């Protein structure tokens, strides 16, 4: 007679996309911090995500810091207010900017009914991007200096700056080359990934 179905959220909503992208950044930032030795290897634990074994921090302060960033990102991503996220890697002793992991975000401001793209398909794309973050490091110059990180979120100039957040300098890098990574999309957001790395000197 009449076909009924118990509602089961399939596809992607603007909220779902924001969730997905913010989560990707949490895992991506964790991978970069581990791969560039920002935090010691023993401060990371193995976890399953996107069909991969990924390393995520156990450091209490870093967990809270990154969680705070991810929560804020979801809000701004839903609003289509994030233009890019950059993980700046600098020589801890000199402050020299050595790498800039740049994630340019494109948004569908019209995002309404849920979009027809499976979570699986999206995870498949993210999986390749995450693998490429680790793969890319094997092609960069050997890093043999202790470094620090800065996480910069570039937003629409008109956004309200929440408490605890601050307008920061751009942390310009110079004498760099780039490695373009695979992009991924939820159909609502598209995340482009690339790393700008400084060419060292023959000293
Ligand atoms: Cl781009
Ligand atoms: Cl690899
Ligand atoms: Cl720059
Ligand atoms: Mg040297």
Numbering used by the authors: 0 to 110, 114 to 205
From the paper:
C79 and C106 of Mad2 are located in close proximity and tend to form an intramolecular disulfide bond, causing conformational heterogeneity. To facilitate crystallization, we created a Mad2L13A,C79S,C106S triple mutant, which retained its abilities to bind to Cdc20 and inhibit APC/C in vitro (see below). However, we obtained crystals of Mad2L13A that diffracted X-rays to a minimum Bragg spacing of 1.95 Å and determined its structure using molecular replacement. The two monomers mainly interact through the C-terminal halves of their αC helices. The dimerization interface of Mad2L13A is symmetric and consists of residues from the C-terminal half of αC, R184 from β8′, and Q34 at the C-terminal end of αA. These residues form hydrophobic interactions and extensive networks of water-mediated hydrogen bonds. Bridged by two tightly bound water molecules, R133 from one monomer forms a network of hydrogen bonds with both the backbone and side-chain carbonyl groups of Q34 and the backbone carbonyl of T136 from the neighboring monomer. In unliganded C-Mad2, F141 points outward and engages in numerous interactions at the dimerization interface. Thus, R184 of β8′ indirectly contributes to Mad2 dimerization by forming an intramolecular hydrogen bond with the side chain of Q134, explaining the inability of O-Mad2 to form symmetric dimers. Mad2L13A, which predominantly exists as the symmetric C–C Mad2 dimer, is functional in cells and is active in APC/CCdc20 inhibition in vitro.
